Amino acid sequence: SNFDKNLPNEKVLPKHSLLYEYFTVYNELTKVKYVTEGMRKPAFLSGEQKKAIVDLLFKTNRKVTVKQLKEDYFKKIECFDSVEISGVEDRFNASLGTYHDLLKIIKDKDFLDNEENEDILEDIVLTLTLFEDREMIEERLKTYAHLFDDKVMKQLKRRRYTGWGRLSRKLINGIRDKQSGKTILDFLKSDGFANRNFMQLIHDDSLTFKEDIQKAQV
Numbered sequence: 001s002n003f004d005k006n007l008p009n010e011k012v013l014p015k016h017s018l019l020y021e022y023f024t025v026y027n028e029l030t031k032v033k034y035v036t037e038g039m040r041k042p043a044f045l046s047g048e049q050k051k052a053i054v055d056l057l058f059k060t061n062r063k064v065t066v067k068q069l070k071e072d073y074f075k076k077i078e079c080f081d082s083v084e085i086s087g088v089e090d091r092f093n094a095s096l097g098t099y100h101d102l103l104k105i106i107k108d109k110d111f112l113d114n115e116e117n118e119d120i121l122e123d124i125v126l127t128l129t130l131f132e133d134r135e136m137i138e139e140r141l142k143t144y145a146h147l148f149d150d151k152v153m154k155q156l157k158r159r160r161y162t163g164w165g166r167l168s169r170k171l172i173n174g175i176r177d178k179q180s181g182k183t184i185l186d187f188l189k190s191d192g193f194a195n196r197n198f199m200q201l202i203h204d205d206s207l208t209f210k211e212d213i214q215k216a217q218v
Contacts, residue, residue, distance in 0.1 A: 004168035006202065007216045013172075014129040015163030016098045018121050019185075023172045023198075024094040025058055026050060026188035030195045032069075032087040036080040047190025052077065058096050059113075065091040098125060098161075105155045106148065120144060122169070129161045171213075178208040 004010045013020045029050045033042035045053070053073055057064045066085055069092075074083040102121065103112050111117055127140045138157045145153065168174075173185040184201055202209045 002164045004166070004171050006171050006213045007168050007175075008218070009216070010168035010170045012167060013122075013165040013169055014125050014161060015165050016129065016161040017125050017165060017169075018096065018098040018102070019118065019169060019173060020165045020167070021094070021096050021098055022054075023167070023185055023188065025054060025092075025096060026185065027198050028088065028092055028094045029053060030188050030191065031197055032085065034074065034086075035084045036074070037082060042084075042086060044193060044195040046193075049073075049078075050189065058092075059099060062095055062097060062100050063091055101159070105159070106152055111147075120147070124156065125161055128156070128159050129163075132160060134158060175209065175212050184209060 002012045004012050029045060032045050034045070035042045053064075053069065056073060056077070057068055061068065066088055069085060069088075070083050074080045098121075099112055102124070103109060106112065112121075124141065124144075127137055131137050131140070134157050138153065141148075141153065141156055148156070171184065173183045176183055177187075184198065187196060187201055188198065196204060201207060202213060204210065
């Protein structure tokens with residue numbers, strides 16, 4: 001029913017898709033800037049810093065505050081003395097809410113952290129977004145009975161997600177830049193010292209995302 005304006009034949013992701021949530025977290029993190037002693041100008045987070053922040057803070061807290069970023073990552077892990085932060089205010093807006101929802105139900109961190117389970121997790125969230133009938137949810141989710149016992153299934157089949165996102169899975173982690181082979185989400189995760197965000201990536205004449213989006217139009 002709802003199609004991605006960038007790729008008009010692709011349907012949009014559920015609002016609570018965990019892939020969509022990771023997109024929002026990395027899009028926000030890639031424009032964070034910091035300054036510590038000895039620096040003459042603020043710097044962007046590196047790909048390694050962004051990954052560590054996601055693993056250490058966003059996977060352990062529904063909401064991440066700037067104080068946690070300063071104390072529990074920059075001081076604790078990077079051993080900075082002091083740090084000033086820009087590009088985020090008070091607390092990060094983005095959240096891996098669905099990571100925490102599913103981790104509480106499934107109680108298997110390794111399952112949630114394993115990106116090879118992406119298709120299963122996206123299918124679960126889509127099912128819980130499309131249907132409000134317990135029986136119709138279980139009819140679709142029982143294909144995963146070999147992974148989830150009846151305690152997990154009883155909880156999942158009563159859960160509901162509402163709302164649609166604005167972007168398709170093919171746009172955010174499908175189309176590849178011609179020269180590099182990287183998806184948009186790949187660039188949000190790591191983009192050298194340029195740290196282009198989503199709006200920059202799809203308007204950048206030195207990449208091919210803009211060209212792909214124009215070709216996808218009528």
